[PDB]
């Protein structure tokens, strides 16, 4: 690995620099390098890892959607034949996206998840596992679409089980997990009623626990609650 020769602390320092410079591919490579040092990650370090890869895959997802839409339009009546280029280029972007997802899932499997024993770490990593299977599901169109969906669901469910046992209802990791699992249900699993039910229950139980929080923790929880509400407005 190209980062094998760089100190862990230096990789973290450079990931932060790359974040400031909006160099997210670099940021991801630095954080991969840090993970591969084999030490567990702190809360802040998990955040750097998450930000880096979310930005990389987010660019890929946006591009894939543009290309898929062009492709879909070319495969209708009245549409002039234009050769294999749109499909080829969509496939190229798709393959790169799957590559990034497989890299993240590889880090989680080797060995972030198994070493994570605290609730905050374990729930964060399992959420991440669900998210990156979800991204794979967005582009899957084969035998394995079903199995990918089940992998995402399994990761999210395991995370949900721990979060409900171990964290308060306002915990931001717990809230973001529930938000993303509700998106999984609505957008991937064709279960809009499960999506709405989860979003409603999560919102209501968080609302009732806000009183326990400091002003700063309150700010964090209510941010995610607003997104649950925005989705509920969208979905109903």
């Amino acid at each position: 690995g190209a980062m094998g020769s760089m100190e862990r602390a230096s990789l973290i320092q450079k990931a932060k620099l790359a974040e400031q410079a909006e160099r997210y591919e670099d940021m991801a490579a630095f954080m991969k390098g840090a993970v591969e040092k084999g030490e567990e990650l702190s809360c802040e370090e998990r955040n750097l890892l998450s930000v880096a890869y979310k930005n990389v895959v987010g660019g890929q997802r946006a591009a894939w959607r543009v290309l898929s839409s062009i492709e879909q339009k070319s495969n209708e009546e009245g549409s002039e034949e234009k050769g294999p280029e749109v499909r080829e280029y969509r496939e190229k972007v798709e393959t790169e996206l799957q590559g990034v997802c497989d890299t993240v899932l590889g880090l989680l499997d080797s060995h972030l998840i198994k070493e994570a024993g605290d609730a905050e770490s374990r729930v964060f990593y399992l959420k991440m596992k669900g998210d990156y299977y979800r991204y794979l599901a967005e582009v899957a169109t084969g035998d394995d679409k079903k199995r990918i969906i089940d992998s995402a669901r399994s990761a999210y469910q395991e995370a949900m089980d721990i979060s409900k046992k171990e964290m308060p209802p306002t915990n931001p990791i717990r809230l973001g997990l529930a938000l993303n699992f509700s998106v999984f249900h609505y957008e991937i699993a064709n279960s809009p009623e499960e999506a709405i039910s989860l979003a409603k229950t999560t919102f209501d139980e968080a609302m009732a626990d806000l009183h326990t929080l400091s002003e700063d923790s309150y700010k964090d929880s209510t941010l995610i609650m607003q997104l649950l509400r925005d989705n509920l407005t969208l979905w109903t």
Binding site: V51, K54, N55, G176, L179, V183, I224, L227, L234
Partner: peptide, 9 residues
């Protein structure tokens, strides 16, 4: 319109 998932901090 697509559903909103968790943002970056």
């Amino acid at each position: 319109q697509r559903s909103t998932s968790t943002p970056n901090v």
